Amino acid sequence: QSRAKASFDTRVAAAELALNRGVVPSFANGEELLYRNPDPDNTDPSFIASFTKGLPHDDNGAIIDPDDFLAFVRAINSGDEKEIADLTLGPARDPETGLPIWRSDLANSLELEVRGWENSSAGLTFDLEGPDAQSIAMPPAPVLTSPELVAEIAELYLMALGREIEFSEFDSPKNAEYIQFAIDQLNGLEWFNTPAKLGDPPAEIRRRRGEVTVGNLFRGILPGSEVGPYLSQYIIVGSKQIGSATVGNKTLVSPNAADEFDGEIAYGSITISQRVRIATPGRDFMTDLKVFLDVQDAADFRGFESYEPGARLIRTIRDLATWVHFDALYEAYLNACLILLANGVPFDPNLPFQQEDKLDNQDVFVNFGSAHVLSLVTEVATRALKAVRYQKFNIHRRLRPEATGGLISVNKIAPQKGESIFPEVDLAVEELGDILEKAEISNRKQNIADGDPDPDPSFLLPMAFAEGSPFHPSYGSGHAVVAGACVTILKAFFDSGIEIDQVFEVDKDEDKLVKSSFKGTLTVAGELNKLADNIAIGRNMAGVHYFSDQFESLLLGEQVAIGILEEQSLTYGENFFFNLPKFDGTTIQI
Amino acid sequence: QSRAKASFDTRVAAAELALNRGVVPSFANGEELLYRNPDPDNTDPSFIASFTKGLPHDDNGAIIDPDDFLAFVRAINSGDEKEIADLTLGPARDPETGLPIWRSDLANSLELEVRGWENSSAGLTFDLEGPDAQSIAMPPAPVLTSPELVAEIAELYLMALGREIEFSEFDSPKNAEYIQFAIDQLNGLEWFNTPAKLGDPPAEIRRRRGEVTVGNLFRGILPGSEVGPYLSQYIIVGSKQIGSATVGNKTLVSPNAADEFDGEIAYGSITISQRVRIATPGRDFMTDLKVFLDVQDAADFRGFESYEPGARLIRTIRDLATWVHFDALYEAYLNACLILLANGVPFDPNLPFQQEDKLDNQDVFVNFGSAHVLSLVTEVATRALKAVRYQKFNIHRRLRPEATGGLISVNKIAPQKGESIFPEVDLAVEELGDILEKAEISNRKQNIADGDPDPDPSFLLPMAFAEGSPFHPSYGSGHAVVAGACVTILKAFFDSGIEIDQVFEVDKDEDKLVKSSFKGTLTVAGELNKLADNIAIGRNMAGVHYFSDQFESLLLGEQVAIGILEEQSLTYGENFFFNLPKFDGTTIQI
Ligand SMILES: [Ca+2]
Ligand SMILES: [Ca+2]
């Protein structure tokens, strides 16, 4: 037939393949309407567990008008520009200046404007390649009263309290007090110490972490993530630099070969420096109730974080949080791909033309080569983002961990003033005694630093970012869905089973890479999974995500990437398949 | 209907949009069969103008067996892995060692193996988004006997002789001798001093450059590349670093704000250094006939280039050649997009949700925001690559400029030995006597440096890369098709009419960015077109592409990008369009 007709038929076949995968129904946890207004004469839902950031809130962190949230949900489901614009975003405005009236003096003195919701209807956006955003479902998010949410808040608060703690020094004596405190606190939670029960949903079983040790503290459950150093090699190490190539028998060494261990990626003929901008140590955000409420009322605090001069390789938890703050969508993965290409990590052996050219007579650049994997790793990201945007806005609308911390703080402060509010987080508040006391001490220190000589006690989750979380619900995670999708693309495309000869850790004292003491072997697949969950738990480290968000959106991203790979496999006449090890330990051939 | 049905219908509508765009026929120049074997007894095609790299060649640069090239074309058109593997790639191999017998002692001493054709059948690959690779055609390439090809190889040789000349010193007295030589030599050519005649095909009229001046020497003809400094801002300057944001009334300044003028793009929380690896100045490649013939016989010389320690902003022509040597597919454009996002260059105002959030109540990250444009600019690249691979291998199969220079060198050496071969390039040889003798002098210096005390005279085109061109025909250009596609994506997505306040140039003396002496204004569209031209002409500066290849593949890439934008616009229910200025000066709304 005609080439144009063949192309149309291939595209229609890809669309049909997407259609026949079927739509997995997306069930939420029912938190949206199950929590009601505590006022006896008000039977309206409180929407405390729902993402209500941007909607006006009362002094306790709940929305004054549930109709605002209902209009927000209607705008999410419709996607119309006008209906979104008709939403009430932020607090009441000044009649004269037109500026929103902020509770915190900081947001008022800055004359902060409101910030809109980030792509509330991107989940309604179709995609021409890969699964539809609404065809793949995440499991219901943990409920506020569940031990899973309590453990997620505990781990979030422990990371927030341990932001200035180096990854290479998790087992170091200097951090031992905090690390043992966090391990004991997590192991004192039903979610971690008690295993999953029979009859629980399979996803809840899969994402339930066991006993928390220093080896797996703040680590993901992806294979190869608890094994080796914390940070993936591709997030801290550079790559074989330009000029370090094997030409026939002689092996030319690049004059800049030290840049590989200096965290410099061979980005074409220029370099990507793996060193991250140093956010100011010990400077948490959204630790004061007024500032937190303003941020919940859409106070545009973006870019208000201060940074130290220069850049350094990710050493502290705050460094990883800063890294995931600004990463350009697929940046972690794109950098991982660039390292793998520059390091000469072989593509998947089942890809065509991967043999020596004396055998196949074919280099691979456009198809099954560097350009192919770069394009796939950077194009899976937006499809995964659309899927996760659907999950965030249209299905779950889960409140961000800062909002959960606000509920916890208000609930804990209520007995001080003699009242009681948010019994839905009572189990979390009682379970996390010492965690919340340490968080209160750190928050009081931060609020004194902010300029309050005698701040009210605050148990808010310390935020690594001034704006806190982005303006989207926490379930799922855009960063972790892109992590899952892009790392799946890389593991399928590259020889993911290739062992990594040199395992590096960031030095304990100096901003440099040192040969890690890890005596085991790290695979490319394991280190890519480690990179994916490094991004995911960096989002957790910022206080913007719970662990279940990260794991389930990593699974969603893997589904996105697998679907995209199946649809692209119809476009190649070459006899080949991608050898993709999934996050559950199995391998799918695409 | 259902969401799955709506998604399938949207994808089918995009496929129908691709199909209904039609397939413009791809015509070649007929050079494949119009040049015949000079032997009276042999009436087979010589294939001298055809891309014959990797097939065995005689001592004069032509293939020994035209059946080898015919099998190569059959393998290109079929795409079968086994049929490509059956192609005779490289010269005869050693029976005892299995290694090919290289003519040059350099390739034999290196024990060089063969390099295969880089995706000789990637043009048969279909695509799920945008035009099919074969649905869009480039015009026929200039013939070896055309004045256009003479001017092309002339500017190629002038770039090769001018590889050590700084872009900021084109109008400087220290380079004035060579610059005036190049200007007078180009203006002495029919292609430049004579305008296009009536009746010429419109593509040749459009791509015919006028009088060569210092202000447009080695420059493209896209709108915005001939005005201002030579290098685009997006290839030399950095971007607003992390921490240099405006939060309400106050304007926080990044402590690393000097990195913006130090060529450090804010790549999320880490930095992309715009400093290119410094290839050894003066070291050209394939200046000796034996090494050149080995490279034509697929000598795997990749990575054999030497580099100076460190990195620097692109100053010399060789720096741009080195930059386009290894650039990761969409790297120039991805970096341009990162600069535009970090600099806060607004997206297209016709995109939705671009107003202040007090008006639209919507941020843009996944759709119509940073993630959207990054994904688009990286996904258009592989589709443009497939289209250009079709153009290269299945349609045009045009010989690389190194092959043209080899024909020229053999034709010029033939009268020295009493013979006469390649009369097809006689017009080029006679029109370029001054340039060819300058190139012979430079080639003699290079060959003495290579280790030949008294090398034979050589008029080979000096190559910036040790392997010379990639294993692909020159018409079209993957780099320039990706430039066209990605710059089109960026100009559509970003407000391309926005004028850049700060115009920088690489300092004449120090490796740094001084304020350019350009008193006019530069726009984002103009600078992106300049970036595309920088990439395309940098491929020319390597000696791997002709100018017409670059320009027509830039047009092909613009077509690819417009197609992809038109397809992807059906995935959005938002009322919007991309305001895309084209390379022809018109604007299309998508
Ligand atoms: Ca191969
Ligand atoms: Ca907006």
Where do the domains of chain A lie? 22-237+274-590
The HSE-up count of residue B192 (CA atoms within 13 Å, CB side) is: 24
- Both tokens of B207, joined, read 């791509």
Answer yes or no: are the C-beta atoms of A532 and A234 closer than 8 Å. Answer: no
Q: Which of A186-196 are b and which e, b meaning 16 or more Cβ less than 10 Å from the residue's Cβ?
A: bebbebbeeeb
Of A488, A497, A479, nearest in space to A566 by CA: A488
Of A302, A308, A241, A236, nearest in space to A269 by CA: A241
- Select the residue from B277, B383, B575 to test the A interface by mutation, using most A Cβ atoms within 10 A: B277
Residue B312: what are its φ and ψ, rounded to 5°?
A: -150, 155
Cβ contact (<8 Å) for A307 and B382?
Answer: no
How many C-beta atoms surround the C-beta of residue A344 within 10 A? Answer: 12
Which residue numbers in chain A precede an interruption (C–N > 2.5 Å)? none
Alpha-carbon distances, residue A441 vs A161, A444, A460, B107 (angstroms): 10, 5, 11, 70
Residue B574 CA to chain centroid, in angstroms?
A: 36
Contact list, B328 vs chain A (CB under 8 Å): 267-268, 338, 341, 370-371, 374
d(CA B442, CA B522): 37
Provide the shortest C-alpha distance from residue B187 to chain A (in Å). 33
* Interface list for B 485-504 with A (CB within 8 A): none
Burial class, A573, CB count within 10 angstroms (exposed 0-12 / middle 13-18 / buried 19+): middle
Q: What amino acid is encoded at B419 in this protein? A: E
Identify the H or E element spanning A478.
helix A478-493
Answer yes or no: are the C-beta atoms of A291 and A105 closer than 8 Å. Answer: no
Using DSSP's 3-state secondary structure scheme, residue B553 falls into helix
Q: Which residue has the tokens 């809130």?
A: A57
- The terminus-to-terminus CA distance of chain B in angstroms comes to 26
Residue B96: what are its φ and ψ, rounded to 5°?
A: -85, -40
Of A331, A289, A280, nearest in space to A163 by CA: A280
A478 labeled binding residue: yes
Q: Is B407 on the interface with A (CB under 8 A)?
A: no
Identify the H or E element spanning B490.
helix B478-493
Answer yes or no: are the C-beta atoms of B333 and B483 closer than 8 Å. Answer: yes
Q: Is B477 on the interface with A (CB under 8 A)?
A: no
Nearest residue in chain A measured CA to CA from B575: A81
d(CA B59, CA B56): 10
Contact list, A2 vs chain B (CB under 8 Å): 23
d(CA A534, CA A159): 13
Beta-strand ranges (E) seen in B229-280 are: 246-247, 250-251, 264-267, 270-273, 276-279
Q: What amino acid is encoded at A331 in this protein? A: E
- The terminus-to-terminus CA distance of chain A in angstroms comes to 26
Q: List CB contacts of B554: < 8 A, sequence separation 6 or more.
A: B220, B222, B480, B481, B483, B484, B532, B533, B536, B583
Cα-to-centroid distance, A195 and ligand 1 (Å):
49
Contact list, A23 vs chain B (CB under 8 Å): 2-4
Cα-to-centroid distance, B354 and ligand 2 (Å):
4
Cα-to-centroid distance, A357 and ligand 1 (Å):
4
Cα-to-centroid distance, B52 and ligand 1 (Å):
18
d(CA A536, CA A323): 11
Cα-to-centroid distance, A247 and ligand 1 (Å):
15
Task: Name the resolution in angstroms.
Answer: 2.2
- Apex CA B387: angle with CA B385 and CA B389, to 5°? 65
- Both tokens of B196, joined, read 């296009």
Q: Is B198 on the interface with A (CB under 8 A)?
A: no
Answer yes or no: are the C-beta atoms of A536 and A269 closer than 8 Å. Answer: no
A512 labeled binding residue: no
H helices within B239-330, ranges in order?
258-261, 289-296, 317-326
Residue B322 CA to chain centroid, in angstroms?
A: 12
Cβ contact (<8 Å) for B116 and A305?
Answer: no
B539 labeled binding residue: yes
Give the ligand whose atoms come closest to the C-alpha of residue A300: 2
Provide the shortest C-alpha distance from residue B320 to chain A (in Å). 9
- Both tokens of A365, joined, read 């650049």
A325 labeled binding residue: no
Cβ contact (<8 Å) for A11 and B22?
Answer: no
CATH hierarchy code of domain A22-237+274-590: 1.10.606.10
How many C-beta atoms surround the C-beta of residue A38 within 10 A? Answer: 15
The structure was resolved experimentally with: cryo-EM
d(CA B312, CA B71): 45
B325 labeled binding residue: no
